[PDB]
Amino acid sequence: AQCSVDIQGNDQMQFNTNAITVDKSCKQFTVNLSHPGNLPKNVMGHNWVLSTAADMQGVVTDGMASGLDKDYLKPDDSRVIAQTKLIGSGEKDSVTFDVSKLKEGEQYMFFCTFPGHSALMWGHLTLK
Ligand SMILES: [Cu+2]
């Protein structure tokens, strides 16, 4: 069935959606990230990272501190429920995670951790 979604990050520092719905009948969910545009990873790299709303800021801040060589994400970050690699234009990456990780009474957010991008590149991921 449909327990997957295609997300795009472009040269204008924007995702093509700020809301993803995960049907409760899904046991696992897949996000397929692509990067239309022409800019390379260093100027406009994008990733897809999922965490609780409360942990978002910490994940973003520590991600920047980790550096481009670590795809701007702190290694073994226990706050990260799902993540794709950092990609440049023309590249792609997919990630699958267990829906059981979406704890009851928690609001999940998806965002890009490349320095400054989360200002525009964010969205809600809700289970229903
Ligand atoms: Cu980005």
PDB file of all heavy atoms in Angstrom, residues 13 15 44-47 86 112-114 117-118 121, ligand 1:
ATOM      1  N   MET A  13      16.186  26.377  -1.179  1.00  0.00           N
ATOM      2  CA  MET A  13      16.152  26.004   0.233  1.00  0.00           C
ATOM      3  C   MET A  13      14.726  25.707   0.708  1.00  0.00           C
ATOM      4  O   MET A  13      14.285  26.190   1.752  1.00  0.00           O
ATOM      5  CB  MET A  13      16.774  27.137   1.066  1.00  0.00           C
ATOM      6  CG  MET A  13      17.305  26.711   2.424  1.00  0.00           C
ATOM      7  SD  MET A  13      18.092  28.075   3.328  1.00  0.00           S
ATOM      8  CE  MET A  13      16.669  28.946   3.970  1.00  0.00           C
ATOM      9  N   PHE A  15      11.483  22.469   0.826  1.00  0.00           N
ATOM     10  CA  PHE A  15      11.007  21.097   0.610  1.00  0.00           C
ATOM     11  C   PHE A  15       9.713  21.324  -0.178  1.00  0.00           C
ATOM     12  O   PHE A  15       9.154  22.423  -0.144  1.00  0.00           O
ATOM     13  CB  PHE A  15      10.636  20.398   1.922  1.00  0.00           C
ATOM     14  CG  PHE A  15      11.796  19.792   2.662  1.00  0.00           C
ATOM     15  CD1 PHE A  15      11.942  20.017   4.032  1.00  0.00           C
ATOM     16  CD2 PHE A  15      12.704  18.954   2.016  1.00  0.00           C
ATOM     17  CE1 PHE A  15      12.975  19.413   4.755  1.00  0.00           C
ATOM     18  CE2 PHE A  15      13.743  18.342   2.729  1.00  0.00           C
ATOM     19  CZ  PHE A  15      13.874  18.574   4.104  1.00  0.00           C
ATOM     20  N   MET A  44      24.339  23.849  -1.168  1.00  0.00           N
ATOM     21  CA  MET A  44      22.929  23.586  -0.916  1.00  0.00           C
ATOM     22  C   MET A  44      22.617  22.110  -0.674  1.00  0.00           C
ATOM     23  O   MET A  44      21.732  21.544  -1.314  1.00  0.00           O
ATOM     24  CB  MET A  44      22.118  24.108  -2.107  1.00  0.00           C
ATOM     25  CG  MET A  44      20.613  24.108  -1.920  1.00  0.00           C
ATOM     26  SD  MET A  44      20.064  25.260  -0.654  1.00  0.00           S
ATOM     27  CE  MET A  44      20.411  26.851  -1.491  1.00  0.00           C
ATOM     28  N   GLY A  45      23.336  21.489   0.256  1.00  0.00           N
ATOM     29  CA  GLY A  45      23.089  20.092   0.548  1.00  0.00           C
ATOM     30  C   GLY A  45      21.825  19.942   1.367  1.00  0.00           C
ATOM     31  O   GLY A  45      21.508  20.814   2.173  1.00  0.00           O
ATOM     32  N   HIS A  46      21.091  18.854   1.143  1.00  0.00           N
ATOM     33  CA  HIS A  46      19.863  18.611   1.895  1.00  0.00           C
ATOM     34  C   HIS A  46      19.764  17.209   2.462  1.00  0.00           C
ATOM     35  O   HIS A  46      20.204  16.238   1.846  1.00  0.00           O
ATOM     36  CB  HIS A  46      18.612  18.806   1.030  1.00  0.00           C
ATOM     37  CG  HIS A  46      18.431  20.190   0.498  1.00  0.00           C
ATOM     38  ND1 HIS A  46      18.510  21.315   1.291  1.00  0.00           N
ATOM     39  CD2 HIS A  46      18.114  20.631  -0.744  1.00  0.00           C
ATOM     40  CE1 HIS A  46      18.248  22.384   0.564  1.00  0.00           C
ATOM     41  NE2 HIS A  46      18.004  21.997  -0.675  1.00  0.00           N
ATOM     42  N   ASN A  47      19.191  17.106   3.653  1.00  0.00           N
ATOM     43  CA  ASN A  47      18.936  15.798   4.225  1.00  0.00           C
ATOM     44  C   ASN A  47      17.523  15.805   4.787  1.00  0.00           C
ATOM     45  O   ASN A  47      16.864  16.849   4.818  1.00  0.00           O
ATOM     46  CB  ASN A  47      19.964  15.390   5.305  1.00  0.00           C
ATOM     47  CG  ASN A  47      20.059  16.370   6.481  1.00  0.00           C
ATOM     48  OD1 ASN A  47      19.158  17.155   6.754  1.00  0.00           O
ATOM     49  ND2 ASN A  47      21.178  16.286   7.207  1.00  0.00           N
ATOM     50  N   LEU A  86      23.185  13.372   3.471  1.00  0.00           N
ATOM     51  CA  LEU A  86      23.105  14.729   2.937  1.00  0.00           C
ATOM     52  C   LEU A  86      23.347  14.588   1.433  1.00  0.00           C
ATOM     53  O   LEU A  86      24.351  14.007   1.021  1.00  0.00           O
ATOM     54  CB  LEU A  86      24.190  15.615   3.549  1.00  0.00           C
ATOM     55  CG  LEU A  86      24.085  17.114   3.254  1.00  0.00           C
ATOM     56  CD1 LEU A  86      22.896  17.705   3.990  1.00  0.00           C
ATOM     57  CD2 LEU A  86      25.361  17.805   3.697  1.00  0.00           C
ATOM     58  N   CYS A 112      15.753  19.650   7.577  1.00  0.00           N
ATOM     59  CA  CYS A 112      17.091  19.501   7.013  1.00  0.00           C
ATOM     60  C   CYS A 112      18.035  20.151   8.036  1.00  0.00           C
ATOM     61  O   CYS A 112      17.732  21.213   8.588  1.00  0.00           O
ATOM     62  CB  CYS A 112      17.197  20.230   5.668  1.00  0.00           C
ATOM     63  SG  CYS A 112      18.884  20.274   5.008  1.00  0.00           S
ATOM     64  N   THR A 113      19.169  19.509   8.292  1.00  0.00           N
ATOM     65  CA  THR A 113      20.119  20.051   9.258  1.00  0.00           C
ATOM     66  C   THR A 113      21.275  20.837   8.647  1.00  0.00           C
ATOM     67  O   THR A 113      22.178  21.242   9.367  1.00  0.00           O
ATOM     68  CB  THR A 113      20.714  18.947  10.164  1.00  0.00           C
ATOM     69  OG1 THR A 113      21.389  17.971   9.366  1.00  0.00           O
ATOM     70  CG2 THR A 113      19.619  18.276  10.968  1.00  0.00           C
ATOM     71  N   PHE A 114      21.275  21.042   7.334  1.00  0.00           N
ATOM     72  CA  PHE A 114      22.350  21.839   6.737  1.00  0.00           C
ATOM     73  C   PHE A 114      22.217  23.217   7.390  1.00  0.00           C
ATOM     74  O   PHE A 114      21.115  23.722   7.561  1.00  0.00           O
ATOM     75  CB  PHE A 114      22.161  21.945   5.218  1.00  0.00           C
ATOM     76  CG  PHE A 114      23.280  22.674   4.510  1.00  0.00           C
ATOM     77  CD1 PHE A 114      24.210  21.973   3.755  1.00  0.00           C
ATOM     78  CD2 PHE A 114      23.397  24.059   4.606  1.00  0.00           C
ATOM     79  CE1 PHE A 114      25.253  22.650   3.096  1.00  0.00           C
ATOM     80  CE2 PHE A 114      24.431  24.740   3.952  1.00  0.00           C
ATOM     81  CZ  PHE A 114      25.355  24.034   3.199  1.00  0.00           C
ATOM     82  N   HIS A 117      19.185  25.920   6.998  1.00  0.00           N
ATOM     83  CA  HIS A 117      18.047  25.465   6.205  1.00  0.00           C
ATOM     84  C   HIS A 117      16.743  25.217   6.940  1.00  0.00           C
ATOM     85  O   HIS A 117      15.669  25.452   6.381  1.00  0.00           O
ATOM     86  CB  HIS A 117      18.408  24.196   5.428  1.00  0.00           C
ATOM     87  CG  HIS A 117      19.418  24.415   4.342  1.00  0.00           C
ATOM     88  ND1 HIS A 117      19.696  23.462   3.384  1.00  0.00           N
ATOM     89  CD2 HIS A 117      20.220  25.472   4.066  1.00  0.00           C
ATOM     90  CE1 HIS A 117      20.622  23.923   2.564  1.00  0.00           C
ATOM     91  NE2 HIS A 117      20.958  25.142   2.955  1.00  0.00           N
ATOM     92  N   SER A 118      16.820  24.758   8.188  1.00  0.00           N
ATOM     93  CA  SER A 118      15.598  24.455   8.930  1.00  0.00           C
ATOM     94  C   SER A 118      14.663  25.647   9.100  1.00  0.00           C
ATOM     95  O   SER A 118      13.498  25.478   9.472  1.00  0.00           O
ATOM     96  CB  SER A 118      15.926  23.831  10.297  1.00  0.00           C
ATOM     97  OG  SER A 118      16.627  24.727  11.134  1.00  0.00           O
ATOM     98  N   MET A 121      13.066  24.810   5.751  1.00  0.00           N
ATOM     99  CA  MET A 121      12.929  23.378   5.510  1.00  0.00           C
ATOM    100  C   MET A 121      12.544  22.586   6.744  1.00  0.00           C
ATOM    101  O   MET A 121      13.379  21.964   7.398  1.00  0.00           O
ATOM    102  CB  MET A 121      14.216  22.842   4.884  1.00  0.00           C
ATOM    103  CG  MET A 121      14.537  23.551   3.576  1.00  0.00           C
ATOM    104  SD  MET A 121      16.002  22.909   2.738  1.00  0.00           S
ATOM    105  CE  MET A 121      15.302  21.394   1.960  1.00  0.00           C
TER     106      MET A 121
HETATM  107 CU    CU B   1      18.884  21.592   3.269  1.00  0.00          CU
END
